[PDB]
């Protein structure tokens, strides 16, 4: 359970559908979500924040997600010099997922036999 | 302009998490008087921009003085360069000069 990340389908569409289950289960209340409907009618988020200085790195959000959108990736080396660099918004989490997608998929090909 | 500076954007009762509406640039903020002025502005919920010439170790005490995002630190200030002065005041409605010798 490392740095949180947001994932896509192979087409390039976001997996997240703003169900707010990960926000409800979070014991630290480290997630803040706002949503409305997109211009094509889809149900998508407009804000998805994770306070990494409030997070406890439990993985409960990863368990609660029904579409495998939020994960905790294999990155542990993400120390910064300012605390404002650790208040992640939606764009940075998507950038993390776009960085770590192949490793996350390799990990999930094994861990889907157990979960 | 008159008293719209202190009233128009004032949000919250006035603590560390509140908003006063002041964006200020303090020149010579790491000095003796400038540090107290920066503490006085930031504790009421104002954004304070602090350019400095010295090393970061001598300016680290200004980082504590305000909430997240409200203390802005700009190292390698050269006051013979107008670009640094232009960047440091580009969002401020208050400028305070404590530079002396």
């Amino acid at each position: 359970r490392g740095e949180h990340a947001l994932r896509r389908y192979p087409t390039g569409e976001e997996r997240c559908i703003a169900c707010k289950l990960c926000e409800a289960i979070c014991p630290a209340q480290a997630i803040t979500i706002e949503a409305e409907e997109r211009e094509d009618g889809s149900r998508r988020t407009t804000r998805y924040d994770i306070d990494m200085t409030k997070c406890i790195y439990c993985g409960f959000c990863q368990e609660a997600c029904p579409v495998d959108a939020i994960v905790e990736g294999p990155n542990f080396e993400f120390s910064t010099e300012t605390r404002e660099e650790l208040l992640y918004d939606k764009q940075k989490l998507l950038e993390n997922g776009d960085k770590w997608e192949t490793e996350i998929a390799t990990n999930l090909r094994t861990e889907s036999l157990y979960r | 302009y008159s008293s719209t500076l202190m009233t128009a954007d004032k949000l919250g009762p006035g603590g560390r998490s509140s908003v006063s509406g002041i964006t200020a640039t303090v020149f010579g903020a790491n000095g003796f008087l400038g540090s107290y002025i920066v503490n006085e502005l930031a504790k009421r919920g104002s954004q304070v921009v602090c350019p400095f010439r010295s090393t970061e170790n001598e300016a680290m005490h200004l980082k504590q003085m305000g909430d997240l995002g409200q203390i802005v630190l700009l190292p390698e200030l050269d006051i013979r360069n107008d670009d640094d002065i232009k960047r440091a005041i580009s969002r401020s409605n208050v400028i305070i000069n404590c530079v002396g010798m």
């Binding site: 896509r8 389908y9 390039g12 559908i17 211009e39 094509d40 009618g41 029904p66 579409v67 889907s112 | -």
Partner: protein, 121 residues
């Protein structure tokens, strides 16, 4: 008796009428009411994607619009979003009758589009 009401003579303020959030074709009729919340109103942002994406970066909506609809034989299709059903979405059963390449049916989980030439047409 009971005269008809003329709705076309009802005045609407021009500031309100020009600011109605509507939809492109997608999963609705084009031009129906789009639900919005208050986020972004202080910054003057009326668009969904601009509220969280900054720059000329390729949006997710522009990614899914480049994938063509998929021809499926039958009347109902099951959508998982993956080859492996454990790795995708909960299964969505999408109606395919009355659908064509021009007016396909869209998955509410994935945004993939499907149509069938099996409903006597």
């Amino acid at each position: 008796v009971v005269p008809t009401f003329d709705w076309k003579k009802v005045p609407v303020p021009s500031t309100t009428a020009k600011d109605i959030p509507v939809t492109v074709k997608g999963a609705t009729p084009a031009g129906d009411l789009r639900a919005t919340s208050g986020l972004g109103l202080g910054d003057g942002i009326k668009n969904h994607t601009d509220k969280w994406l900054d720059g000329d970066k390729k949006s997710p909506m522009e990614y899914i619009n480049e994938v063509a609809p998929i021809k499926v034989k039958g009347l109902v299709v099951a959508s998982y979003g993956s080859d492996d059903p454990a790795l995708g979405c909960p299964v969505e059963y999408i109606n395919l009758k009355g659908t064509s390449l021009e007016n396909p049916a869209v998955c509410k989980y994935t945004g993939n589009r499907y149509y069938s030439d099996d409903w006597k047409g």
